[PDB]
Motif scaffolding. Structure first.
Motif, PDB file in Angstrom:
ATOM      1  N   UNK C  17      39.012  51.542  52.265  1.00  0.00           N
ATOM      2  CA  UNK C  17      39.636  51.242  53.566  1.00  0.00           C
ATOM      3  C   UNK C  17      39.852  49.782  53.790  1.00  0.00           C
ATOM      4  N   UNK C  18      40.573  49.152  52.773  1.00  0.00           N
ATOM      5  CA  UNK C  18      40.614  47.709  52.570  1.00  0.00           C
ATOM      6  C   UNK C  18      42.078  47.405  52.495  1.00  0.00           C
ATOM      7  N   UNK C  19      42.543  46.585  53.416  1.00  0.00           N
ATOM      8  CA  UNK C  19      43.927  46.222  53.731  1.00  0.00           C
ATOM      9  C   UNK C  19      44.334  45.261  52.732  1.00  0.00           C
ATOM     10  N   UNK C  20      45.138  45.749  51.742  1.00  0.00           N
ATOM     11  CA  UNK C  20      45.732  44.954  50.676  1.00  0.00           C
ATOM     12  C   UNK C  20      47.014  45.480  50.315  1.00  0.00           C
ATOM     13  N   UNK C  21      48.018  44.638  50.028  1.00  0.00           N
ATOM     14  CA  UNK C  21      49.337  45.080  49.646  1.00  0.00           C
ATOM     15  C   UNK C  21      49.464  44.857  48.180  1.00  0.00           C
ATOM     16  N   UNK C  22      50.583  45.360  47.637  1.00  0.00           N
ATOM     17  CA  UNK C  22      51.093  45.512  46.340  1.00  0.00           C
ATOM     18  C   UNK C  22      51.222  44.187  45.708  1.00  0.00           C
ATOM     19  N   UNK C  23      51.683  43.192  46.556  1.00  0.00           N
ATOM     20  CA  UNK C  23      51.900  41.824  46.226  1.00  0.00           C
ATOM     21  C   UNK C  23      50.658  41.111  45.791  1.00  0.00           C
ATOM     22  N   UNK C  24      49.476  41.405  46.407  1.00  0.00           N
ATOM     23  CA  UNK C  24      48.230  40.692  46.010  1.00  0.00           C
ATOM     24  C   UNK C  24      47.770  41.026  44.636  1.00  0.00           C
ATOM     25  N   UNK C  25      47.660  42.342  44.339  1.00  0.00           N
ATOM     26  CA  UNK C  25      47.267  42.811  43.091  1.00  0.00           C
ATOM     27  C   UNK C  25      48.094  42.375  41.850  1.00  0.00           C
ATOM     28  N   UNK C  26      49.414  42.364  41.975  1.00  0.00           N
ATOM     29  CA  UNK C  26      50.166  41.822  40.890  1.00  0.00           C
ATOM     30  C   UNK C  26      49.923  40.377  40.615  1.00  0.00           C
ATOM     31  N   UNK C  27      49.804  39.557  41.731  1.00  0.00           N
ATOM     32  CA  UNK C  27      49.537  38.132  41.499  1.00  0.00           C
ATOM     33  C   UNK C  27      48.119  37.961  40.886  1.00  0.00           C
ATOM     34  N   UNK C  28      47.118  38.723  41.374  1.00  0.00           N
ATOM     35  CA  UNK C  28      45.751  38.717  40.848  1.00  0.00           C
ATOM     36  C   UNK C  28      45.580  38.950  39.349  1.00  0.00           C
ATOM     37  N   UNK C  29      46.244  39.973  38.750  1.00  0.00           N
ATOM     38  CA  UNK C  29      46.212  40.201  37.288  1.00  0.00           C
ATOM     39  C   UNK C  29      46.680  38.992  36.494  1.00  0.00           C
ATOM     40  N   UNK C  30      47.879  38.353  36.899  1.00  0.00           N
ATOM     41  CA  UNK C  30      48.424  37.214  36.239  1.00  0.00           C
ATOM     42  C   UNK C  30      47.542  35.955  36.131  1.00  0.00           C
ATOM     43  N   UNK C  31      46.865  35.561  37.274  1.00  0.00           N
ATOM     44  CA  UNK C  31      45.783  34.575  37.280  1.00  0.00           C
ATOM     45  C   UNK C  31      44.567  34.914  36.409  1.00  0.00           C
ATOM     46  N   UNK C  32      44.080  36.193  36.493  1.00  0.00           N
ATOM     47  CA  UNK C  32      42.938  36.608  35.755  1.00  0.00           C
ATOM     48  C   UNK C  32      43.158  36.496  34.266  1.00  0.00           C
ATOM     49  N   UNK C  33      44.309  36.877  33.704  1.00  0.00           N
ATOM     50  CA  UNK C  33      44.540  36.674  32.299  1.00  0.00           C
ATOM     51  C   UNK C  33      44.759  35.222  31.781  1.00  0.00           C
ATOM     52  N   UNK C  34      45.257  34.279  32.677  1.00  0.00           N
ATOM     53  CA  UNK C  34      45.438  32.896  32.209  1.00  0.00           C
ATOM     54  C   UNK C  34      44.190  32.174  32.382  1.00  0.00           C
ATOM     55  N   UNK C  35      43.189  32.827  33.062  1.00  0.00           N
ATOM     56  CA  UNK C  35      41.876  32.268  33.329  1.00  0.00           C
ATOM     57  C   UNK C  35      41.803  31.791  34.776  1.00  0.00           C
ATOM     58  N   UNK C  36      40.899  32.509  35.586  1.00  0.00           N
ATOM     59  CA  UNK C  36      40.617  32.120  36.925  1.00  0.00           C
ATOM     60  C   UNK C  36      39.187  32.539  37.036  1.00  0.00           C
ATOM     61  N   UNK C  37      38.278  31.741  37.661  1.00  0.00           N
ATOM     62  CA  UNK C  37      36.901  32.203  37.837  1.00  0.00           C
ATOM     63  C   UNK C  37      36.872  33.399  38.782  1.00  0.00           C
ATOM     64  N   UNK C  38      36.141  34.480  38.541  1.00  0.00           N
ATOM     65  CA  UNK C  38      36.195  35.688  39.420  1.00  0.00           C
ATOM     66  C   UNK C  38      35.526  35.272  40.777  1.00  0.00           C
ATOM     67  N   UNK C  39      34.581  34.338  40.817  1.00  0.00           N
ATOM     68  CA  UNK C  39      33.908  33.853  42.038  1.00  0.00           C
ATOM     69  C   UNK C  39      34.862  33.080  42.848  1.00  0.00           C
ATOM     70  N   UNK C  40      35.593  32.146  42.107  1.00  0.00           N
ATOM     71  CA  UNK C  40      36.693  31.420  42.802  1.00  0.00           C
ATOM     72  C   UNK C  40      37.754  32.260  43.345  1.00  0.00           C
ATOM     73  N   UNK C  41      38.272  33.202  42.563  1.00  0.00           N
ATOM     74  CA  UNK C  41      39.346  34.073  42.890  1.00  0.00           C
ATOM     75  C   UNK C  41      38.991  34.859  44.127  1.00  0.00           C
ATOM     76  N   UNK C  42      37.807  35.406  44.187  1.00  0.00           N
ATOM     77  CA  UNK C  42      37.341  36.287  45.221  1.00  0.00           C
ATOM     78  C   UNK C  42      37.233  35.671  46.514  1.00  0.00           C
ATOM     79  N   UNK C  43      36.661  34.402  46.482  1.00  0.00           N
ATOM     80  CA  UNK C  43      36.475  33.569  47.637  1.00  0.00           C
ATOM     81  C   UNK C  43      37.754  33.210  48.274  1.00  0.00           C
ATOM     82  N   UNK C  44      38.850  32.966  47.456  1.00  0.00           N
ATOM     83  CA  UNK C  44      40.125  32.712  47.980  1.00  0.00           C
ATOM     84  C   UNK C  44      40.656  33.847  48.808  1.00  0.00           C
ATOM     85  N   UNK C  45      40.543  35.109  48.339  1.00  0.00           N
ATOM     86  CA  UNK C  45      40.913  36.301  49.128  1.00  0.00           C
ATOM     87  C   UNK C  45      40.158  36.604  50.343  1.00  0.00           C
TER      88      UNK C  45
END
Lengths: 49, 51, 56, 109, 59, 59
Positions: C17-45
């Motif tokens: 029950x977590x409000x997220x659109x289609x747009x977030x998830x696609x951008x998220x995969x692309x950062x994660x594969x080029x390297x993004x810290x999961x702690x950093x990434x999460x905190x940003x969201x």
């Protein structure tokens, strides 16, 4: 009397800088303005209020 | 506990930095103050014409 | 890779029950594969989410 | 929010209506840093922390009373803002033994 | 307004038992703040800092 | 009164030597007075420890 004081003060109109009953004041025009060096100049225009 | 502390630290830094920049700029250049010197200079050339 | 991964993430987010659109998830995969810290990434969201709530 | 946070700054100090400016701006900055909490809502969990705390300070009777007061509280009117209220009272909870040193001699440092 | 009077009498019992040390007028400010929405961490954090500050200022 | 300060200084001085410390009595005598002037045990500990950190580096 108003005409005499005005005339005497303005030194027969030869002072356009202020009126004063002084015969020993040096007649000097103001130095070139601040912005003259940027904008050139144009003729000065006076008013009546 | 750390993640929340971390996120809060960066946010203070950004805020405080904004305020300090605004303060440094204001005393460093103020257009208001520059004009009153100029108005005052305009006055001086007219003074030296009156005497 | 992107579309299929997005479809799986989207379904999980809906369970939460977590409000997220289609747009977030696609951008998220692309950062994660080029390297993004999961702690950093999460905190940003988490932070971005809190701001839209304060503003709104 | 501004008139409310301010009035808090005047009352706490018990004096000053612009002499509390320093404290206001400070409160505003603090509130302006984004805290995130450890657990948000659930009436039962906050109520429990308060019960355990009661036992721990040797005010067992009072802890017994607090439960009556909690139920009573719902019936005089239902709260949507309770977790936060019950927390605030939690963080300000004290022990009946000992003093916190001097804080009226600490000003001179 | 009738409602507003009843809640505060029960609330004042918890706070005085639990040791909190807020008079009536101040206890009303926090309830306003919590209804308009506030992080709970901030509210406790200020109250503790203002109190520590106040006692030193006085003395 | 002179005896009382001294007897007190002494019981503390036996205990200090037992837990080991490079500190002289005179600084330990100040600490008692700092505690007596109030002040939370964590603030007192931190400053003492810090002075010791600063001394050791310096010499």
């Amino acid at each position: 009397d108003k005409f005499e004081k005005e005339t005497r003060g303005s030194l027969f109109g030869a002072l356009v800088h202020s009126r004063t009953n002084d015969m020993d004041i040096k007649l000097d025009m103001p130095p070139v303005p601040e912005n003259a060096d940027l904008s050139g100049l144009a003729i000065k225009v006076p008013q009546s209020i | 506990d750390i993640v929340n502390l971390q996120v809060e630290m960066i946010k203070q830094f950004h805020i405080q930095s904004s305020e300090i920049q605004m303060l440094l700029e204001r005393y460093s250049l103020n257009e208001s103050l520059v004009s009153e010197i100029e108005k005052l200079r305009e006055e001086n050339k007219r003074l030296r014409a009156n005497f | 890779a992107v579309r299929e991964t997005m479809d799986v993430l989207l379904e999980i987010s809906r369970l939460l029950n977590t409000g997220l659109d289609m747009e977030t998830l696609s951008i998220c995969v692309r950062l994660c594969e080029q390297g993004i810290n999961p702690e950093a990434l999460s905190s940003v969201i988490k932070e971005l989410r809190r701001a839209s709530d304060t503003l709104k | 929010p501004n008139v409310l946070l301010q009035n808090l700054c005047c009352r706490i100090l018990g004096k000053g209506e612009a002499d509390v400016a320093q404290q206001f701006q400070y409160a505003v900055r603090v509130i302006g840093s984004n805290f995130a909490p450890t657990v948000e809502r659930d009436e039962f969990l906050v109520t429990e922390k308060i019960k355990k705390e009661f036992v721990r300070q040797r005010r067992e009777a009072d802890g017994a009373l607090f439960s009556e007061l909690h139920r009573k509280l719902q019936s005089q009117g239902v709260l949507k803002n309770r977790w936060s209220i019950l927390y605030l009272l939690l963080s300000l909870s004290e022990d009946p033994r000992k003093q916190p040193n001097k804080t009226s001699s600490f000003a001179a440092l």
